[PDB]
Design a protein around this ligand. Structure first.
Ligand SMILES: [Zn+2]
Ligand SMILES: [Zn+2]
Lengths: 5, 184
């Protein structure tokens, strides 16, 4: 699950 | 019956939106639509079905897309709720979101009261002890900490949505239906 990069 | 004209909404509500924008660093992730390419989050629209942000809300105020001010409040919380859903509790963006929401909660009541409402508080104060909604991000062992929206009753005469707990009291009966103060 992605995260704000 | 009561119709809100765009300039009355914009004039009353816009300073609550500016109070969010003033928050630095906290507003910065909220100032434009989330771009999942740019941000490296290709599963974003898998999770957030209905995005919202400060710029879209400002554009809605600026071009008259809200008929009544609970629609503005709903978009503010849809933006907050999307961000608390997507981002982890430990992430910067989540924590910024909570700050913006704190700021909102402190600004919105006086302004909603200036527009004839009881207050501007969307959610009940605490979860109900156990024995959707336009701001709830939609979905296509639990923990008892969910806050539901405070339910409404409409004024029969002006059509304003008022909270049942703000306006209906344990010693008053309304056999012909609730009517708000002024109106009354
Ligand atoms: Zn209220
Ligand atoms: Zn009324």
């Amino acid at each position: 699950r992605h995260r704000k990069v | 019956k009561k119709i809100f004209k765009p300039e009355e909404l914009r004039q009353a509500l816009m300073p609550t939106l500016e109070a969010l924008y003033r928050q630095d660093p906290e507003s910065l992730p909220f100032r434009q639509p989330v771009d999942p390419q740019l941000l490296g989050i290709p599963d974003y629209f898998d999770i957030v079905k209905n995005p919202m942000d400060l710029s879209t809300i400002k554009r809605k105020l600026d071009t008259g897309q809200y008929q009544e001010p609970w629609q503005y409040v709903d978009d503010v919380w849809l933006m907050f709720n999307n961000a608390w859903l997507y981002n982890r509790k430990t992430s910067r963006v989540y924590k910024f979101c909570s700050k913006l929401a704190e700021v909102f909660e402190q600004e919105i009541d006086p302004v909603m009261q200036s527009l004839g409402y009881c207050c501007g508080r969307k959610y009940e104060f605490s979860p109900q002890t156990l024995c959707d909604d336009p701001s709830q991000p939609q979905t296509t062992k639990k923990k008892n900490d969910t806050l539901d929206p405070e339910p409404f009753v409409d004024c029969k005469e002006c059509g304003r949505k008022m909270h049942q707990i703000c306006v209906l009291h344990y010693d008053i009966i309304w056999p012909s239906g609730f009517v708000c103060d002024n109106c009354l």
